[PDB]
Amino acid sequence: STAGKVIKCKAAVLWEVKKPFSIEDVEVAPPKAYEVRIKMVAVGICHTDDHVVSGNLVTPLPVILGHEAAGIVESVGEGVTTVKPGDKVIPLFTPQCGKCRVCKNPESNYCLKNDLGNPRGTLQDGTRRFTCRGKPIHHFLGTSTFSQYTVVDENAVAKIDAASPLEKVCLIGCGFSTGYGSAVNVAKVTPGSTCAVFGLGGVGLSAVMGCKAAGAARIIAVDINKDKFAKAKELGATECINPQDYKKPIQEVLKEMTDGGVDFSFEVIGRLDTMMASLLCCHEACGTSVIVGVPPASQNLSINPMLLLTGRTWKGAVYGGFKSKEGIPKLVADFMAKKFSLDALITHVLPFEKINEGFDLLHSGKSIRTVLTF
Amino acid sequence: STAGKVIKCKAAVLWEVKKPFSIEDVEVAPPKAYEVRIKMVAVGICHTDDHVVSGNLVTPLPVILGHEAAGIVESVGEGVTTVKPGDKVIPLFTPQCGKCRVCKNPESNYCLKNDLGNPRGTLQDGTRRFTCRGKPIHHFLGTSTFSQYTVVDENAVAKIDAASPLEKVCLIGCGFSTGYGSAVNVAKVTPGSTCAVFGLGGVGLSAVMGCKAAGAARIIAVDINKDKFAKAKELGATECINPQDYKKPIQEVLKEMTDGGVDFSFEVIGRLDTMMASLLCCHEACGTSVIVGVPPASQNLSINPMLLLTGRTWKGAVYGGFKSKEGIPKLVADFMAKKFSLDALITHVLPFEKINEGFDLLHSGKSIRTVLTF
Ligand SMILES: [N]C(=O)C1=[C][N+]([C]2O[C]([C]OP(=O)([O-])OP([O])(=O)O[C][C]3O[C](N4[C]=NC5=C4N=[C]N=C5[N])[C]([O])[C]3[O])[C]([O])[C]2[O])=[C][C]=C1N1=[C]C(I)=[C][N]1
Ligand SMILES: NC(=O)c1ccc[n+]([C@@H]2O[C@H](COP(=O)([O-])OP(=O)(O)OC[C@H]3O[C@@H](n4cnc5c(N)ncnc54)[C@H](O)[C@@H]3O)[C@@H](O)[C@H]2O)c1
Ligand SMILES: [Cl-]
Ligand SMILES: [Zn+2]
Ligand SMILES: [Zn+2]
Ligand SMILES: [Zn+2]
Ligand SMILES: [Zn+2]
């Protein structure tokens, strides 16, 4: 095996913002106690990965990005009980340490041992495991799955069904769980209700799916890129509207179209103007607006506090409200049991080496999710 | 007798903003079909009334203010089937019109016939029922209880228990129902949780009581007026914090005091800095922040949407989430069932003619609720 030995493999390093990925040869040190070394089989490109490339999300450079993924355990460190080598696993962008405030709370999932809050770029011990040209490389959200091998803490890796199609199931690691849990667990969309979803990406369309499973009688899907509408209708939307077709602001069009406004609105893009439209379009006495998109670093919204006073609920969440180590394995089992399908979401599969192309298909709005294979 | 004809009474007419109320002789027209003329027995001075006097809440002038009240049914107009003459009744500042969207929705309470959204200052039909000096006077929130007689719509009136201490129970017409319902029905406080309450006025203290009736294990009362703390301790707060004692910002004080922040925050004052400090003092990953105070006109908060993505909820509510025509009767009956006391909150009683003196006691911070009798 390679167990106990520093592996040398290919990985894509981002040496600085707004520039392409460099496929480098890196050394991945052995897992320490309670750490798992994972062999990557497939990874998806989530838009949060792009946010670090543009400068919208801040984290220390150079770094190896990636978090929506699935692979097999090469070795485990001492103490690792939940997984044996050879296990199929999905690494988690937010852990479930089980012992913290947020973790013993039945309704919360943003565990304290995360690296989104104040990004260190290391693993939980404050150390890094990758070296490229003798220089130490930074981790991203403790996962850094854009490498042929990665080391993640044990509380951040989930063991899934041994019959899992890892070329599909990786989307449950970030995209699908987030969009579907936003509807089903964060907003708790009622049967017979009316929802509006802004942005029809891999995380957006999963929310349209989540609302139809909850029983929403109407799912108006909003996107400026009209080519996404056909997939949206197939997956559940009843109406698809495009902002640029009207001379009057989208929240108004939506109130008039729905006798005051929808009951649940979902923002799954990341811009401030659409976060405002999403609050503004749900009914002032009975709407719940949910923020799923990651906003630009340090930008601020200006809301009139009176908008919330008549009865609105505004909130957001990470991972579609899912506690990660427990939630991702059960969703993989529902996949196994054919309760939902991920096929319409994966529009492209490219080899790892073609990663910079993957990021270009997201910039041209030609893809929903591109899967890089190793 | 009076039934069917213009009564002449004394009323507190606000003619100009930030000017004294005048006690005038006004003519109260008879109730049209589905209206009720009530003889006032006692009223509470709520801080919202003072927002109209200050010019913080715009409404058409001249107007007779007042909305926290209790009285006796004098003549009911034709078609009225819920109340008969002589019955004890409490006016409602938010109606329960039975058939509108919000009314038909089990979770919401801000019914469409309210006059807060865009005030007309009339009853639910575009007409006013008071005249004074040859001029018509506007109604406020369709109740206008600072008059010896007032005509209200039928769906904005609830029948309460016959033996009700009208000079106590009138609190349930805003102050008590708001604070208590805000914790019990809007936040939905949990057994064992930690709550924080900004503002210890009649509404705030009914919220301190609400957290205690929900089983909040720790309740932290916040106020710049240190004389409110004994009442607050008495009614349920485990600690009282005075912002001016610290060299540190108050949310920081509270987060350090609760291992991350409180579970539920309630802002019951109407100021943008406290409104901000309440969202910030709740835990980023699981706290719910509820706006109960009424904000000044056209004032805006800046908010980094990232504050909500980690898992915070922000919502507001009018009336404590109570569907008015029904909630208020039931609460009166729980009061009658000897399940709570309103005495602690009442700190002064004055004859109606003393109205301006009563607004002054609010302003001097010596009072909580002050009742004016007829
Ligand atoms: N929270 C959480 O968890 C999350 C979040 N996230 C987010 O989301 C968003 C989005 O993503 P995606 O889906 O992946 O991507 P895409 O594909 O790109 O999509 C987008 C869309 O949108 C649209 N638009 C734009 N613009 C516009 C629109 N629409 C309308 N309007 C306008 N203006 C386009 O076209 C498309 O379609 C982002 O932000 C992200 O970030 C995700 C995930 C999740 N995570 C978290 C983490 I820390 C990581 N991950
Ligand atoms: N949601 C609604 O249905 C509803 C209903 C009634 C009242 N209200 C609003 O609730 C708010 C309070 O109502 P009230 O009638 O109980 O008024 P109140 O005057 O008796 O209470 C205000 C309290 O806030 C305290 N306070 C003021 N500035 C403070 C500061 N910077 N920090 C801490 N404490 C401060 C004051 O000392 C006072 O104790 C008002 O805005 C009123 O308009 C809303
Ligand atoms: Cl008139
Ligand atoms: Zn992601
Ligand atoms: Zn934890
Ligand atoms: Zn109604
Ligand atoms: Zn009031």
UniProtKB/Swiss-Prot annotation, chains A, B:
Its cofactor is Zn(2+). It holds the Pfam family ADH_N. PANTHER family: ALCOHOL DEHYDROGENASE (PTHR43880), ALL-TRANS-RETINOL DEHYDROGENASE [NAD(+)] ADH1B (PTHR43880:SF11). It comes from Homo sapiens. Dimer of identical or non-identical chains of three types; alpha, beta and gamma. The keyword DNA damage does not apply. GO terms for molecular function: alcohol dehydrogenase (NAD+) activity; all-trans-retinol dehydrogenase (NAD+) activity; zinc ion binding. Zn(2+) 2 binds at residues 97, 100, 103, 111. Its EC number is 1.1.1.105. PROSITE patterns: ADH_ZINC (PS00059). Belongs to the zinc-containing alcohol dehydrogenase family. It catalyses: all-trans-retinol + NAD(+) = all-trans-retinal + NADH + H(+); all-trans-4-hydroxyretinol + NAD(+) = all-trans-4-hydroxyretinal + NADH + H(+); all-trans-4-oxoretinol + NAD(+) = all-trans-4-oxoretinal + NADH + H(+). Catalyzes the NAD-dependent oxidation of all-trans-retinol and its derivatives such as all-trans-4-hydroxyretinol and may participate in retinoid metabolism. In vitro can also catalyze the NADH-dependent reduction of all-trans-retinal and its derivatives such as all-trans-4-oxoretinal. Catalyzes in the oxidative direction with higher efficiency. Has the same affinity for all-trans-4-hydroxyretinol and all-trans-4-oxoretinal. There are 7 different ADH's isozymes in human: three belongs to class-I: alpha, beta, and gamma, one to class-II: pi, one to class-III: chi, one to class-IV: ADH7 and one to class-V: ADH6. CDD domains: alcohol_DH_class_I_II_IV. The gene is ADH1B. This is All-trans-retinol dehydrogenase [NAD(+)] ADH1B. One of its GO terms (biological process) is retinol metabolic process. Keywords: Acetylation, Cytoplasm, Lipid metabolism, Metal-binding, NAD, Oxidoreductase, Phosphoprotein, Zinc. NAD(+) binds at residues 199-204, 223, 228, 292-294, 369. One of its GO terms (cellular component) is cilium. Binds 2 Zn(2+) ions per subunit.
